[model samples]
Target: NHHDDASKFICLLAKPNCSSLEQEDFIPLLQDVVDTHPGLTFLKDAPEFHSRYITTVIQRIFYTVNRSWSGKITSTEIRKSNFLQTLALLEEEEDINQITDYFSYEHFYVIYCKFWELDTDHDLYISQADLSRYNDQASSSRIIERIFSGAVTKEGRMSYADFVWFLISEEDKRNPTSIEYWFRCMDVDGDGVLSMYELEYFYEEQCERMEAMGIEPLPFHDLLCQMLDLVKPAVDGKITLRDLKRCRMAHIFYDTFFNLEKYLDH
Candidate 1:
């Protein structure tokens, strides 16, 4: 009775992978998760665990099932293809607008289109200048610059995944995982601190963007003090990812920085 505890309990199924997988892989993925995670794999249990142990709790459970059944869950890493397979598994009917997972190529296609719009230079990434084109407000461009500031993968770049996460997090900031995902981009120095200089670096584009149009830009001091008050960082006065996570009001930070309307109201 390795799995037999003698107690009868019914767990809801994890979310089903709903896209175009062949019929055979469905049950395998399902039973695979059941061993470790021990969920019904219904609607609620549909998220890929990250590369960390604690992060992959749901995935670990599912993988446990796979290992337990076959005498070994031996893979140190799960395939990205497999994760995509599972993400396509949807639990319930959703409107077109309700979609968030990558089960459909259509979503990726749309993302590509949006990227093309921003990547007018054919450089494969939206520079801070390209970002400014998306909106004209001084306050709005400042937020866009910061958005780019966090997205530099190389000397000056933003990858497809970086932009995708940025777009999605902007839409909905509820998930802690999403916050962590965006935080990696915002951390700038990779030193775990969002320094004042980092904020200004991005805001510089916003400042010039307004100056060109004969409008005076609000100094970073205006927004920084406000954002600092909102974040209320430590004595060093830098916004740490730790502070953002613990605060649980990350949506506010996201809003105040990038969101023009929200910035003005406050």
Candidate 2:
């Protein structure tokens, strides 16, 4: 029902498989199209303010009225003002900020591309088998199985949004959203609490892998004690998803089996 040719065309400008656009990424975008082409004379020689201007405008875009909860501008939200007029430059195409996003327009496409790569069947969902394409590490291989076993619904088909969270969690476990994403995955029984049994299940897989490699396996209790010190859960006893989200060091628990460096270092 939407035909934002201008926005769509603007999207075509993005480099495929790109990371979410940071403020730095916007500099050339505005510089090439605005300050240079449109001749925003005041900024003609202003290098000091290049980053400044980009930051100011990016904030304005996120705060713009009618932005979706995930922080993207919708056509309906655009107002009839000098701001809208300035947006007129992008009038050559029609587009709206995509639903699958981490922040900027480019990031959405990047995630989408990754999804398309994983969804080899084009069924709009990815299977654990398809995720092996992500990398070639033994620890991660087992962890992926744990995630699929516990997190994914019975259908085992992950939508793009779900895939994004999982990928980010694997990439940078310290991020809060990443923690929440993996926490829900590790909550095997959907009870909101990560029991010792559940933790041992995923870790046992790694222990077996190490044993297969001829290394004496790290025991579960040894791992749990370290996790306790790392997360220092405010709760008196058991670790909950809330505990994971509250402590950045909590990632060490997940990393204990998956991150070889952290495992050895610990």
Candidate 3:
């Protein structure tokens, strides 16, 4: 069992390359690799490759499954079979790029690049202006305001870890947790429901931005009808998290209002 610990961790770090890998040789190899890997190194703020920060990297890797609101992964849970299940999929493949799950190095690079591009000061935190610089301000200011001010994050600024959740929810709104993440932001007043005014709050800014771009903005009433048709909330004029859960088109619903790039694409 002690031998398996190093082997399991090695397989978790190196997929197809782990085949016939010598567990005893992993420490030195990983030490050099982590020392130089750009994405891995970005997780820590200092110059040296410290052990705790690698544990920080490992904690973020654990987020791919059995996640928590606190975003913590204990050592006991890290050793669990369920946590390693995602790594098993790479056994038959050599190209890591083919699998872009959060755990993969490719995805980490993508996430870190985006974060690095936004954190212009390289302070390891994204301010509103920094985030607004994202995709040429594709997201509405109202949503960005909600993102920082509301319960989605307490820091009022985005850390790299928080950005991970943000980008995941932003890119893949279909997931249940992502749906709830946006839902909480849009559910102003914390009513556990998304009211018309709340929807309109975000849409109003979207409309002005579209008009500024020389595009005709859809009337809120018209857009409301489309949203209702897509979500089909149990109540006539209110949308709930449960309603969104039942709607496979929830991503479209979210994209329509705030994300101008995606909204235009739709």
- Best candidate (score: TM-score): 3
In lDDT terms, which candidate is top? 3
* Residue 22 lDDT (model 2): 33
Clashes per candidate, residues 3 or more apart or on different chains: 21, 11, 0
Per-residue CA lDDT of model 2 for 123-153, tens digit only, reads 7778876766543343456567656675532
- Candidate 1 lDDT over 32-142, as tens digits, reads 533333222232353332112121222223322332223222122223224433444444424322433433334544655777887877887767776767655523654
lDDT of each: 0.50, 0.56, 0.67
The TM-score of predicted model 3 comes to: 0.70
Task: Give each model a TM-score.
Answer: 0.48, 0.53, 0.70
Model 2 residue 20 CA deviation (Å) reads: 27
**Global Cα lDDT for candidate 3:** 0.67
Give the candidate order by descending TM-score: 3, 2, 1
lDDT of 2: 0.56
Q: What local lDDT does model 2 show for residue 63?
A: 33
Q: What value does the lDDT take at residue 133 in candidate 1?
A: 70
Q: In candidate 2, which residue ranges exceed 4 Å CA deviation?
A: 1-102, 116-125, 133-153, 235-237, 257-266
Which rank order by lDDT, best down to worst? Answer: 3, 2, 1
